[PDB]
Paper text:
At budding yeast origins like ARS1, a double hexamer (DH) of the [name] replicative helicase is assembled by origin recognition complex (ORC), Cdc6 and Cdt1 by sequential hexamer loading from two opposed ORC binding sites. Cyclin-dependent kinase (CDK) inhibits DH assembly, which prevents re-replication by restricting helicase loading to the G1 phase.
During the G1 phase, a pair of hexameric [name] helicases is loaded at each replication origin around double-stranded DNA in the form of a head-to-head [name]-DH. To determine whether Orc2∆N can promote MO formation in the context of origins with two high-affinity ORC binding sites, we performed cryo-EM on early time-point (2 min) [name] loading reactions with either WT ORC or ORC containing Orc2∆N using the 90 bp synthetic origin. Although MO particles were amongst the most abundant single hexamer (SH)-containing particles with WT ORC, they were not detected with Orc2∆N, even though similar numbers of DHs were detected, consistent with the biochemical data. Approximately 3 Å resolution structures of DHs, formed with WT ORC and Orc2∆N, appear identical. Moreover, DHs formed on the 90 bp origin with Orc2∆N are fully competent to support replication with purified proteins. Therefore, Orc2∆N cannot form MO, even on a template with two high-affinity sites, but can load functional DHs very efficiently. Although pre-phosphorylated ORC did not support replication from an ARS1-containing template (compare lanes 2 and 3 in Fig. 3c), it supported replication from a template containing the 90 bp origin almost as well as unphosphorylated ORC (lanes 4 and 5), indicating that the DH formed is functional.
Author numbering:
A (entry chain D): 2 to 106, 131 to 200, 204 to 303, 319 to 340
B (entry chain 7): 232 to 385
C (entry chain 6): 258 to 429, 443 to 463, 512 to 763
D (entry chain 4): 177 to 203, 215 to 283, 295 to 730, 740 to 852
Amino acid sequence: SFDRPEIYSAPVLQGESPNDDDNTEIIKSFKNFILEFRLDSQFIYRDQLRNNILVKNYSLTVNMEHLIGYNEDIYKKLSDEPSDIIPLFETAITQVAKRISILSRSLPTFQLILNSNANQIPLRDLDSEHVSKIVRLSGIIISTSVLSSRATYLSIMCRNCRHTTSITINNFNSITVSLPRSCLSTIESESSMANESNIGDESTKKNCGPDPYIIIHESSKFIDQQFLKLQEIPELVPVGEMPRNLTMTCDRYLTNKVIPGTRVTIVGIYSIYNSSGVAIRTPYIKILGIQSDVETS
Amino acid sequence: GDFLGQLITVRGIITRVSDVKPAVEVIAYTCDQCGYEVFQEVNSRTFTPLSECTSEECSQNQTKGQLFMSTRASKFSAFQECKIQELSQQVPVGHIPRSLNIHVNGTLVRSLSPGDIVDVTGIFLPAPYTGFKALKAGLLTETYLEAQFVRQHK
Amino acid sequence: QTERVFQISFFNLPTVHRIRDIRSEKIGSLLSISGTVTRTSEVRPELYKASFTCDMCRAIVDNVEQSFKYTEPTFCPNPSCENRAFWTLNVTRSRFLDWQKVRIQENANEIPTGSMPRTLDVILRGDSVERAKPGDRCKFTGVEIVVPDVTQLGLPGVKPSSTLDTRGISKTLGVRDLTYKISFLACHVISIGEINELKEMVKDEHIYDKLVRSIAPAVFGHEAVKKGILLQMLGGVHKSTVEGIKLRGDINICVVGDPSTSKSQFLKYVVGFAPRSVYTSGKASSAAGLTAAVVRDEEGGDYTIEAGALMLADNGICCIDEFDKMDISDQVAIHEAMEQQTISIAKAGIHATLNARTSILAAANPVGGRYNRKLSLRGNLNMTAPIMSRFDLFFVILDDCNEKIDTELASHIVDLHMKRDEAIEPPFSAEQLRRYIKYARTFKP
Amino acid sequence: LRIIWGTNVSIQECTTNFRNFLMSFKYFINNTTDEELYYIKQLNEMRELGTSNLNLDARNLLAYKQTEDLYHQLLNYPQEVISIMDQTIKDCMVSLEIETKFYKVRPYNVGSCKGMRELNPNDIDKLINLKGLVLRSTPVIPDMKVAFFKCNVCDHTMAVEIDRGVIQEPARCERIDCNEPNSMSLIHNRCSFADKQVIKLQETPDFVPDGQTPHSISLCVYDELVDSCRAGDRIEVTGTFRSIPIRANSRQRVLKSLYKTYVDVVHVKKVSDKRLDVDTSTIEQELMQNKVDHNEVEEVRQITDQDLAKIREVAAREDLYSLLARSIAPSIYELEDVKKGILLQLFGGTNKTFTKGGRYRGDINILLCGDPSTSKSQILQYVHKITPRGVYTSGKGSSAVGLTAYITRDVDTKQLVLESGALVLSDGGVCCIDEFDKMSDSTRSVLHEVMEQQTISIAKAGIITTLNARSSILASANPIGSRYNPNLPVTENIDLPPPLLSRFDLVYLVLDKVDEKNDRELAKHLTNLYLEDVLPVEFLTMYISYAKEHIHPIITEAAKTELVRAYVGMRKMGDDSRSDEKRITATTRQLESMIRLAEAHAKMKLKNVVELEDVQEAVRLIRSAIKDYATDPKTGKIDMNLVQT
Ligand SMILES: [Zn+2]
Ligand SMILES: [Zn+2]
Ligand SMILES: [Zn+2]
Ligand SMILES: [Zn+2]
């Protein structure tokens, strides 16, 4: 009738010398950038982060061309493999804000909103090249769906044995984590009396069932997700053809920022999802920034 | 069973004493990629060694180093196991004397020898069942005694 | 029409290595070793080049090299199928070889001080099978190999282990144990250890006396025992009647004396001279070590018999010292070997009849230390009546006190110590005498 | 002062600290070798001889002021200190092939400690020394160092190095053209291996706490120290203290929390100043193998020329025979005739080998009959402790299986192995049987062959072979009833068949008489010991080993005449008293006994010639042992008025 053993660590020695394309070095270079980069004599991003934390907006808006004059390597990587770098750049901001809150007196992952002023590919100039890459687009909004609920933290329980665990999601861009198919009590032979409670009932093996996990909703947390459609400017369209449109997805601090009838600049990732032909996929854009030309007052 | 988890003293005679061997409590590992040190806790009679690194750096980077055991850093204890039997004047009329198990750790080893009459202070604690499966009904457990202070009558 | 398997055989190397000198820096090289053979197995087929069928597609892959293990193909040859793990075996169209296993032991003269003999497993292939008999001294030329060994899990020390390198694999567990023991695979097997002289011997008309005077030269006198031993080395005739009654043709001798008499030197002479002879003592021998024992093969599916003293002396002489310290259980087996020439085995569900056509040389101590001249022979011995009846000759050695004989005996004993081996000058040598005995046994009077 | 993590060692500090000591060492002191630069002779002679191992005593360093620190550090971190000590050598050697040859050190004087079972878990990875008797050793085991991989799609061969036991198998072929996943195969016989052997040792500590039964220890010897130890050997071993976790069973990768213990041997010592040197006549081929294997384990001891000069200076002494007999047991007030037999037993007869097969050995066998309450028991103990190989047996405590051989189950490998017995472990030594008369006829049976041919023949399940038992027998027997009765014959006083009594070379009748000046001397002798010339132990053992090693005596005709005359005279006596077992009848073994004793007496005093004096002394001793100078040849009775002390 014993307890759960633990695993813990502590730094001792210098390991192998660090390769510059290491993830930790990327996080450290981006944390240096945040608190170092200067324009004129004001440290813009530290001040911005402090002010945003005062008003409970957990986000940072970064102008993309400010980094192509500080560290071009991490710029090339971001424009080439955005899905791998964005999660890493989202750790440094949380780490900095953690210190700021503690010294200026439950913080979720911080959202990175990208705003840019550069080349703009038209909506009809999209091909196989731009897949898993960052593009800049202009157009008009015609649709905005209703906000949907998606999980970030899930607490679950097994309906047969009563084993409990948790799940954390920090990747909401796909439109995926799922609930475990088998009870995790058997693979985590953790306690000395637990593997003994797993037996009995004459001669047989504890079988919980095909999918036995129930979600305890009062102990879970959620976020908002939206769908939008962008249309090409109805003026520079081929004569006698229907205008083409694209489907875009956004969440957290980008929702309810626009209304249909607005002309906008969007920065995002060109990706696909599965929905006649041997192997065909449907494209869509993950939103990373919104800028409106001018709004109808 | 009323006496489990308490501090109790016993009176008996020692029948067998085992040698002194090391018992592992925390195992130490060294990663060449990061230079951290991983410490694994053991409280069973059998355990499974770790394979991959669980450091923060290795946990983040895709490249994860391989673990090796460092004997010197580990946590070790001195272990002995003793059997104690009833005195003749305590056995009921017509029955045979019974036995019990005692555990010793630390600087209290090499203090009991076979053939001694003693009074042992210990903590009465349970252990997992080790009998036949077909004869198991419920959550049955075994008992052992954790030595803390030894008195000898001679 | 298949191709013929070819085998190469090297021999006549410069040096021969002892079993207790094999090291691990000679692994996979050519060497020659010596030893004594105890156990052999039956001949069984071995997988050499196999044919496999694909389970995704049905293609045929032929002539896969096995190399000491059950190897499977690692890539479908069709540029389309991507099968690498799923295969089935056509046992009808695969090529086999012949396979036997032999067990060897260290020779008596090569054992160090205070230690026990060592063993080694020898593998034979092809045409080399069935050349080694139990109880032989052979020289092997071959290659020193390593085979898996799961008995080492428990020995102290660091035992090497294998794992796959995870540095370089793109991601978004097969540990194997390297424990081996040293074995031997052989390509050449040899068993080690003119008419002018034979026709010269046959003529001499004092040949009998010379032969008598050439036996056990180190012993002084006792000519009757010398004659008996020769007649026992030569033999009689084996006959069979119409009714299947078998008439026996082996001579059995017993020498009776007290611990003072020189009766063990006769036995030691015969165990050093005769081709197939074994020396055993009363209280250092068990029944299983005389008749036979049954052991099971690791390969599985069969069993093997291991020979005892009586089987290793088939068509030969078995020497037993201290016959009076034998048990009734052993004596009932010796009687079976003497009336019948068979040994019966029934243990663990194995039935087997084995051949023991052997002669018995036995030395017995009087019942009370000394021989009582006032009692009969039966009163002085401790044997079962069935055993005593089937002995042909009983020789009793008694002591006499005569001065001239004592002078001669003492002179002889001191001469041997002073002059080493230049104190015998026998009529014939051992190599001469073996040839004559071999020639003599082929006559049927 | 860089400190290696987890230690207090600075590599540069210790290397520089070590090279000054190695280039300058100091120390009833001489002026020839005790005041010269010591270790540069040791290195120069090493490189000259073509040798690779330096043997480094330890207490050398606990005096020289600098390297005191290094002694404590060597007894605590053997792994890190011994790699510093080698780089000093191969640097020091060229400072004086030597650019491609590897050097080693071997500490052999670590002291203190009080046995394996007194060591705690805090003594893991420490240097300790052990003494004991070897029983078993497993055959050589191959250990992998470099592995061989073949690409089955491109035939590119790769080699890998073991790193602390683990092998890294490449996932992708290394060829830039053939880059396949999982194409690497292992070919076992193309790999590089090394040697490993496991020994089992019966520990013989000095302090035995109350109620410790003997136990056994496991030792791992690698590379050079293979076949350097044989069962029956009493050795001294230096090594490290380790621990290892074991797997619960073959199928599962699960381990057991309680650890297993053993010792990594670094140095082995097979000599002692206070014991005799092994018989080279029995290990001829091991000496040849050691040179072929280049292991510098020294079996025999070194003799300087001052000490060898002392040897002949003493060997010239007039009273050598009395002096040697006196210094055998310097604390047993007893007749010199009894001690002379032990002295000549130690020298042993000349071993002779015929070139047509046929071996004659020179082992002496002695029986000590006589009243109880004598010092027979001490003689056997003293001889047990001076001879290199021996076992002590009781009468009614032995079995034939326990004396010859047996099969046992090894708790490590769980298989059945063969193990040696009492008499085979005593090969080239002395076996002491106490209370011989109380032993069964079944157990007495096995001794006949050992006393006749010095072999044993075993036909049991698994073994059919002949074993070598070249041992000396020293036996003591108790007389029937209270005391020896002079009125009865000897054959009626000892419960042993008269035919068996004739197999012994010497039979000693130890009789007790009441006489006032003998009693006075014995009482003063004993009382002098409870208060607060002779040859010390070292010199005695050295002399005996020298004689047993070099000289070899051969007999002459003048001796032959006397031998034959003596044998005939002995047989002619009592020719009428043979039917009645009054006296011990004479046989040919007595002739051989005279031969053996003459050769042993010749070997003493360092001759190669057995002259007439030797045979006369041998016959004198044989008669004096049986007390034939006081026996009535008709009745077999002893006149005690004539038995003088
Ligand atoms: Zn469950
Ligand atoms: Zn790591
Ligand atoms: Zn296929
Ligand atoms: Zn390849």
